[PDB]
Amino acid sequence: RTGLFTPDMAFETIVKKQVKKIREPCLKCVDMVISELISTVRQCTKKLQQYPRLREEMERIVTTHIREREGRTKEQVMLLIDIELAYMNTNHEDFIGF
Amino acid sequence: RTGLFTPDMAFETIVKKQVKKIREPCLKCVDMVISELISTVRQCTKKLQQ
Amino acid sequence: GDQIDTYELSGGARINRIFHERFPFELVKMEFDEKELRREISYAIKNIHGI
């Protein structure tokens, strides 16, 4: 067809292409925060020096826990982007009417 | 979905809906013309032949 | 596709979009008494300071 009005699938295709790029910095930010937390736990364990075998165990246990929560945090981060691709809401603060 | 741009079927389906109304008078015109052709053939046969 | 209900009714998923733009109406029925908000702010400040 010759077309009479501007199509709407072009806007959705372009937006979806730009939206797919955000996955990288979010998965960087998660690793950065994990590293900082492990640092602060290692600072907090400096006060147990008079007890060997208890500074090791407490480091191991809190570190293992913090590491294991990474998978679930990343899964949620990915899902929140999939949610952004699934539906294009144009009734927000946008060029309405234009 | 959400209404960003005016769709093209809002035009196409209203036009297609109004165009379908034209079938009736077009077939009335054909009936009228067949009426006249039958009339004239009757005039010619009445006038000439006994 | 073609063959849409141009005259009769909204149907199918055009009702769902009404839900998506009627939910804002449910979000504004949640009324509250202002003087209860001020009462709870006050008791929150007092309980947060403590001694």
Which residues in chain C touch residue B1, judged by CB atoms under 8 angstroms apart? 17
**Which residues, 6+ apart, have CB-to-CB distance to A78 below 8 Å?**
A23
Give the chain B residue whose CA is nearest to the CA of A4: B8
> Are A77 and A26 spatial neighbours (Cβ–Cβ below 8 Å)?
yes
A42: its two tokens = 């290692």
C24: its two tokens = 């804002």
Resolution (A): 3.3
**Which residues, 6+ apart, have CB-to-CB distance to A54 below 8 Å?**
A48
Task: Look at residues A86, A96, A88 and name the one whose alpha carbon lies nearest to residue A8.
Answer: A88
CB contact under 8 A, A5 and B7: yes
CB contact under 8 A, B1 and A88: yes
Give the chain B residue whose CA is nearest to the CA of C7: B14
SS3 C24: helix
> Are B13 and C6 spatial neighbours (Cβ–Cβ below 8 Å)?
yes
| C-alpha dist (Å) from residue A70 to A34, A36, A46, B33 | 8, 13, 25, 85
Quick one: DSSP state of residue A2? -
> Are A80 and A4 spatial neighbours (Cβ–Cβ below 8 Å)?
no
Q: Is the dihedral of CA C28, C33, C35, C38 positive or negative?
A: negative
Kindly write down the DSSP assignment for every residue of A29-69, as one continuous string.
HHHHHHHHHHHHHHHHGGGGTTSTTTHHHHHHHHHHHHHHH
Question: ∠A96-B3-B5 over CA atoms, to 5°?
Answer: 75
Is B9 at the interface with chain C, CB within 8 A? Answer: yes
Q: What approach was used to elucidate this structure?
A: cryo-EM
Kindly compute the dihedral angle of the four CA atoms of residues C37, C39, C44, C49, in this order, to the nearest 10 degrees: 140
| Alpha-carbon gap, residue A1 to A58, rounded angstroms | 70
Is B2 at the interface with chain C, CB within 8 A? Answer: yes
> Are C4 and B13 spatial neighbours (Cβ–Cβ below 8 Å)?
yes
| Alpha-carbon gap, residue A26 to A31, rounded angstroms | 9
SS3 A10: helix
Nearest to A5 among B1, B2, B6 (CB): B6
